[PDB]
Design a binder for these strands. Structure first.
Ligand SMILES: [Zn+2]
Ligand SMILES: [Zn+2]
Lengths: 358, 361
DNA sequence: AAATTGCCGAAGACG
DNA sequence: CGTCTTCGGCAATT
DNA sequence: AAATTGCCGAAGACGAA
DNA sequence: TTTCGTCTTCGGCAATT
């Protein structure tokens, strides 16, 4: 039953091959143009992130996320006051010249000014691409990305994400996040927290104070690693180990939310990251690979469903990396909307998931 | 018995006071030697340090009185030539220009002389040790088969420090290792692949039995990989971590090392055997029995017994494959006479059959 | 660049 | 069995 | 130095017993 | 049936030229 849904969601190699060929061509051209053109972004490097690169993209390979990350030495973060997720970026005392000086709006780094120049560079190179049908999508509120729309002829979206990279210890709001000690272990946690951290523009258009200078933490790199290294046993899903159903449960939950969001505008405020965050908590709660045996896919999916519903009921879904940041706060999603989603999930759960049959 | 093995482990356990005092002195001497070699105008200026062996693996028993340290020198653009299909032994040649590389005076042909390099390495170390006035330390006379310059420190307690000369190469490992490191069902394929992307090391064979190419033969060293495995030894990521379960893998290795050490002290016919034979055997046993549950501390006696049984079968069949170089038989007739292996079998059998009287000190 | 700095896991020491 | 402590390893940073 | 090279893990494609 | 084994391609990483 769920097995057939998973077969339907599984990507086809031909599609993957055709999509990746084009995406890689465009992205490499844009990355290299950025690295060579005289600008503040000369030093960008690429990190592929998101569902496709985590092997959990469903149905079609038509969405690609790519970070163009820029190391920014000697920064000092100022927490956007209550929120452990949002920050203003200031600079420690400079030796002989900050090359991001043109982007300073006060003492603070302007995400809006940096993004405008970044966007300008991408657009000017995209105009020169004559061998692929690609355009830059008009800027969207709340997005840290320059989005490309490719017609291959099939529609493919590529989010080029501007990120600042900082190699120091992670912000203190993350100190009690990443609770993987009983699952992936303390060596893994310590190693993950020695990798850099990333800030991307919040880019909200709400007109709130500091809107052009507010940055958001991103842990897409850590999430990617975890998805590829997700078992308590080192051999989980490897060629000399046992397959688990962890990723399959995530695919199913994303599909459920995707189908619901398709026909209910009441669910605009919900997104796949809510589901991803929920399953990370579930992987922490149930760390043993044997709790994710393929033979128990049905019960595993139901357990995840129950957990998500309880998050909705209690209006609490802690960010996995920033515990004090509630993705289900009233301020973020109205109490009315969570109740709506609960009802819908409860329906599908109690009626054999009809929405899975399109 | 369970009681005796527990008491033996208690006795073998190092004391923190002893550790602190030994490390303090060792660290001072090694740092001084490393900096001297890096600061001076010598062929060895780029050396970097890697601590290895039992102490740094947390399996040194009884006293913190033996320290191994590699001074590793990167050698870009070399070509290896396997010496007599041994798989463990190599001649080293240089690819090309600029021919203003160091080590040019170490060539005995197009072939890098281990003996010439080791002599200069030893000469530099000896000169600096002569200037050490705050610690009682001397350089031990060269020993056959050693890749190390050995220091003897009196702290006042005797401490030996092996300073090992190693060449570092960052390319893929020699082909003789291709089917070695059989950890795929235990530590896994990502771990194996990542470990085989670390550099490989060559150290002087430094034999003195007069064979051809004696001064130019190098042998592969996997001490860095072994150290990693010892600190990362569980099928579960949480093995022996603060939020995981303690296993008895290292404790079994301690017991077997102690057994061999005690037998070696009273029987000189066991001269051919060494702790590496024990280490190699247990790496195989960890591959054979990969589950952390197969190394539960409550089953210490049975775990030690299975390792003994496995070692005895290696002895009987005269075959103990190098864990990293499968075709290299540590228990071959050429390396260890048949009579010596039969003698050790009888002794281990006797100890096992009698509940380890030799452990009664 | 050398070498100080910060962190935290491993395992001995201590209620 | 828990919690404290010190040594070691790694790399960001000055 | 920027970018080719080489490896091999993850997982899709597919025939077999 | 479900699922090995085999073959395959795409991507991550870094040593190298
Ligand atoms: Zn798995
Ligand atoms: Zn363990």
């Amino acid at each position: 039953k769920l097995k057939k849904v998973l077969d339907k969601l599984r990507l086809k190699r031909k599609d993957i091959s055709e999509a990746a060929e084009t995406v890689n061509k465009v992205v490499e051209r844009l990355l290299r143009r950025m690295q060579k053109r005289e600008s503040e972004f000369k030093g960008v490097e690429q990190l592929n992130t998101g569902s496709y690169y985590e092997h959990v993209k469903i149905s079609a390979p038509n969405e690609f996320d790519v970070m163009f990350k820029l190391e920014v030495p000697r920064i000092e973060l100022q927490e956007y006051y209550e929120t452990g997720a949002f920050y203003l970026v200031k600079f420690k005392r400079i030796p002989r010249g900050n090359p991001l000086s043109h982007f300073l709006e006060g003492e603070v780094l302007s995400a809006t000014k940096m993004l405008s120049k970044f966007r300008k560079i991408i657009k000017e190179e995209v105009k020169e691409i004559k061998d692929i049908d690609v355009s830059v999508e008009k800027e969207k509120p709340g997005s840290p990305a320059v989005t490309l729309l490719i017609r291959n002829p099939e529609e493919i979206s590529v989010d080029i994400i501007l990120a600042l990279e900082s190699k120091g210890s992670w912000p203190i709001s993350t100190k009690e996040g990443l609770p993987i000690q009983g699952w992936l272990g303390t060596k893994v946690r310590t190693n993950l927290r020695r990798e850099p951290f990333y800030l991307v523009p919040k880019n909200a258009k709400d007109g709130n104070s500091f809107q052009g200078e507010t940055w958001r933490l991103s842990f897409s790199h850590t999430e990617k690693y975890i998805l590829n290294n997700h078992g308590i046993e080192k051999t989980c899903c490897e060629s000399s180990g046992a397959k688990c159903c962890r990723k399959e449960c995530l695919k199913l939950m994303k599909y459920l939310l995707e189908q619901l969001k398709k026909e209910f505008q009441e669910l605009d405020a919900f997104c796949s990251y809510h589901v991803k965050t929920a399953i990370f908590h579930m992987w922490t709660q149930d760390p043993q690979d044997s709790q994710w045996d393929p033979r128990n896919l049905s019960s595993c999916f139901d357990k995840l469903l129950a957990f998500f519903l309880e998050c909705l009921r209690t209006e609490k879904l802690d960010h996995y990396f920033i515990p004090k940041f509630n993705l289900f706060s009233q301020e973020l999603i109205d109490r009315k909307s969570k109740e709506f989603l609960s009802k819908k999930i409860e329906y599908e759960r109690n009626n054999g998931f009809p929405i899975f049959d399109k």
